[PDB]
C-alpha cells in the first residue's frame, strides 16, 4: 500500500467533482474512470459509477468502504464457471 508519509491518493477531477456534489446535494451518480482513488469520508451517501473496462458500475458508498480504492467494487473480469 501507499506510504502514510505521502497521504492517501485521490484523483483531482473526482475530488473536485465530489466536493461540488457534496456542496450542491447532487444525487446523480458520479461518473468516473478513476479506480485508483482512495475513498474519503466525504463520499458517504453518494453513488459512484466507477469504470471497469466496458461500463460504469454504480457503487453506493457506505461507512465500511473508507480507505479502499474505487476499483475494488468494480470487478473487471467476468467469470461464470467453466462447465
Amino acid at each position: 500500500p501507499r506510504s502514510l508519509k505521502k497521504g492517501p491518493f485521490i484523483d483531482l477531477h473526482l475530488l473536485k467533482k465530489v466536493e461540488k456534489a457534496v456542496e450542491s446535494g447532487d444525487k446523480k451518480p458520479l461518473r468516473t474512470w478513476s479506480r485508483r482513488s482512495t475513498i474519503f469520508p466525504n463520499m458517504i451517501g453518494l453513488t459512484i459509477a466507477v469504470h471497469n473496462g466496458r461500463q460504469h458500475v454504480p457503487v453506493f458508498v457506505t461507512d465500511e468502504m473508507v480507505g479502499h480504492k474505487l476499483g475494488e467494487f468494480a470487478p473487471t473480469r467476468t467469470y461464470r464457471g467453466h462447465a
Partner: protein
C-alpha cells in the same frame, strides 16, 4: 517498430526534459518530512495535474536504429540484433567475440 511508437518515445523524452525540474522539487516537498501537511497535499495535487508523459518512468528504451522495445542494451543504445550486426561489421570499437 511503428513510426507512431518512435514519435511517442520522442514526445515522452521531450516532455520529461521540459518538466524535469518542477516535478523534482514537487517530489522533494512531497517527501520532505518538515513540510506542512497542506503543502504536501497541494503538491500531490500539482503532481497529479502535471502531464503523465513527463514522468521519466513512462519511457521505454528503444533501439536507436529500429525502435525495438525488447532486447535493449544501455551501453550501445541498440537492440541485440543491431548490436550483433554492428559488432560483426566492426562499427563498435573494442567489441570482439569473447572466450575464456
Amino acid at each position: 517498430a511503428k513510426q507512431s511508437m518512435k514519435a511517442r518515445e520522442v514526445k515522452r523524452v521531450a516532455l520529461a526534459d521540459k518538466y524535469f525540474a518542477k516535478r523534482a522539487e514537487l517530489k522533494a516537498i512531497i517527501s520532505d518530512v518538515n513540510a506542512s501537511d497542506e503543502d504536501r497535499w497541494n503538491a500531490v495535487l500539482k503532481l497529479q495535474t502535471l502531464p503523465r508523459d513527463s514522468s521519466p518512468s513512462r519511457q521505454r528504451n528503444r533501439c536507436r536504429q529500429t525502435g525495438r522495445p525488447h532486447g535493449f542494451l544501455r551501453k550501445f543504445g541498440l537492440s541485440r540484433i543491431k548490436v550483433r550486426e554492428a559488432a560483426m561489421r566492426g562499427e563498435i570499437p573494442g567489441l570482439k567475440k569473447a572466450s575464456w
